[PDB]
């Protein structure tokens, strides 16, 4: 006879993700997808509106004590807080924190924290950093759609001090050309590249003919800041950044000691760094107001400042100011 006896018992595979495990686009590069664009992409992949998916799954995990079905028939602002809203949701705010935590738990993904700036909480001041209204680069969207590439909004577009796309040298457009209104970042249905109000198109060959060199340092520094966070491999330590700033201050002081003229070029930044080192270290520092000009005068990229260790940073500073020190 036949000795083979099959067994059809189930195998009990590990629990699957509640939502699709969509990869974030261009993580670690100056063109990383914003959390808002990722939310809209996940909603589009599920054939659900961002609002509807939000109260379907994120709201019960965010809003702890409510009836989930009764939450299914509300406005997005009840849990997002549209009184604030703004592209600042991409920042380091509390609702951003809990939203990122819930999203990472739902898809068991380990990179959504890089799609925002919670890794820089306590490091970079929130005020004066993010735009109030949605912005886009029409050339980017048109090129992406023509090349059959995924549409999304980079983090750089959410910053006030980023107004130009270095790829296309085009000033960011905050107003829909069709309806004339300015889109909020969060809406009931706002797929990337589309007008959240009139459903019109926002990608056109718009030419940028301004002095982009003025804002080049700011945009490149912010791009480096976004692109560097996923590559660190750890949560940054506040006093690490504080002591790097202090080391740059000491290098500045030694350079001034060697050359008196440099005091004229660096006095204001010296005073600002001294104040930032005398105030509480746990207090965040204003990114564009303090760190970017400081590393600019130090002739050091934001990537070099936040990435290199103390030895490399000290050696490069000494070489940059031609000092004879060796740490």
């Amino acid at each position: 006879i036949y000795s083979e006896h099959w067994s059809l018992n189930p195998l009990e595979i590990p629990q699957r993700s509640r939502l699709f495990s969509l990869e974030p686009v261009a993580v670690g590069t100056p063109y990383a997808e914003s959390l808002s664009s990722y939310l809209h992409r996940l909603a589009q992949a599920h054939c659900l509106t961002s609002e509807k998916l939000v109260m379907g799954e994120i709201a019960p995990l965010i809003l702890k004590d409510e009836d989930k079905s009764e939450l299914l028939s509300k406005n997005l602002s009840h849990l997002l807080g549209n009184s604030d809203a703004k592209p600042a949701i991409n920042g380091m705010r509390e609702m951003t924190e809990k939203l990122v935590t819930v999203l990472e738990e739902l898809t068991m993904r380990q990179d959504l924290r890089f799609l925002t700036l919670l890794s820089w909480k306590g490091m970079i001041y929130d005020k004066g950093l993010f735009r109030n209204y949605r912005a886009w680069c029409p050339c980017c969207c048109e090129e992406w759609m023509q090349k059959n590439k995924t549409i999304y909004e980079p983090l750089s577009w959410s910053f006030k001090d980023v107004e130009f796309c270095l790829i296309h040298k085009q000033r960011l457009i905050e107003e829909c050309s069709h309806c004339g209104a300015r889109l909020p970042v969060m809406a009931r249905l706002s797929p990337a590249g589309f007008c959240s109000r009139c459903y019109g198109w926002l990608g056109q060959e718009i030419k940028g003919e301004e002095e982009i060199e003025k804002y080049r340092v700011n945009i490149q520094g912010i791009s480096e800041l976004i692109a560097l966070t996923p590559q660190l491999g750890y949560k940054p330590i506040p006093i690490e950044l504080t002591r790097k700033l202090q080391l740059i201050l000491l290098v500045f002081e030694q350079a001034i000691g060697k050359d008196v003229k440099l005091l004229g070029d660096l006095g204001g930044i010296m005073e600002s760094l001294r104040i930032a080192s005398t105030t509480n270290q746990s207090q965040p520092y204003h990114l564009v107001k303090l760190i970017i000009p400081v590393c600019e005068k130090a002739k050091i990229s934001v990537f070099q400042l936040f990435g290199s260790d103390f030895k490399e940073l000290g050696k490069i500073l000494f070489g940059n100011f031609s000092l004879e020190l060796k740490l």
Binding site: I1, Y2, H5, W6, L8, I13, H46
Partner: protein, 310 residues
Amino acid sequence: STGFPLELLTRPATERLAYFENYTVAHPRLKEVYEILMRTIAEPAGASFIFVYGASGVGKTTLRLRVEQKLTELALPKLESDRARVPVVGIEAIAPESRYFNWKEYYTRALITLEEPLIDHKFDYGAPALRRALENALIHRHPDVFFVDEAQHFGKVASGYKLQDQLDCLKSLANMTGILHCLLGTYELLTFRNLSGQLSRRSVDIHFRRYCADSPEDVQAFKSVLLTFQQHLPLAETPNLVDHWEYFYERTLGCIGTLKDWLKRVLSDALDREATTITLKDLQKRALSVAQCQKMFKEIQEGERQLSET
């Protein structure tokens, strides 16, 4: 071993019935079809359809579950690393209450199987919304195969040309996701096998042949499966079943599943009466009606004639 565990005699009747019901035997046709199906699954070779025919009771459902389980355990070592990676998906088609087959029900049931959240609410980013949701779910969840049991219910349409339009809709679902579709059904399946070049090229046909009484090798195989079923019957005494091989074949038509369910009925009847052996009248009590056997034989003969194209 050829014998059932000997401590099962002291156990209650329910335990013996359970041991018998979750026990299944591998006869040569079933294992051959299993190897062929898994070879096609591992290497689709550009074919998006693995249509499997067979008589009512050859073991189509059992083969489906076995393939699902084995592919699941083959994929298991890597599901810990990668999530949203359902290995295989197997659902059964629903006969429509209305005259025509319903596709909204098909799409929503497929979404239910994939644990799609907020299926009822949905939206259309442009049943088109349900179809797009199913396409996206198949693309992202990345299933290896897609079994659709009882594929004869697909052609519950009064239009002869829409009969292949059902498979046209399934095919349009398949291409934009590139997921293998291995449909299973009865002989009312050949009305869908190779219609049009699209379904004639990318479809691989597997026939779950039954055990016919003409070839002496098949007769010997049927006798051997009878012998192993007798030796695996959880009774105090082993009844002699190989002798009435003609009687067992008459009411089963060679379908191994029919033999299994008939023997399950007889064993349960014996256990309820606390009997120790199986009598001929015990088999006669729960035998299938002659008219029923005639009807299924006519159906499988017509199916074999249709599939006899060379």
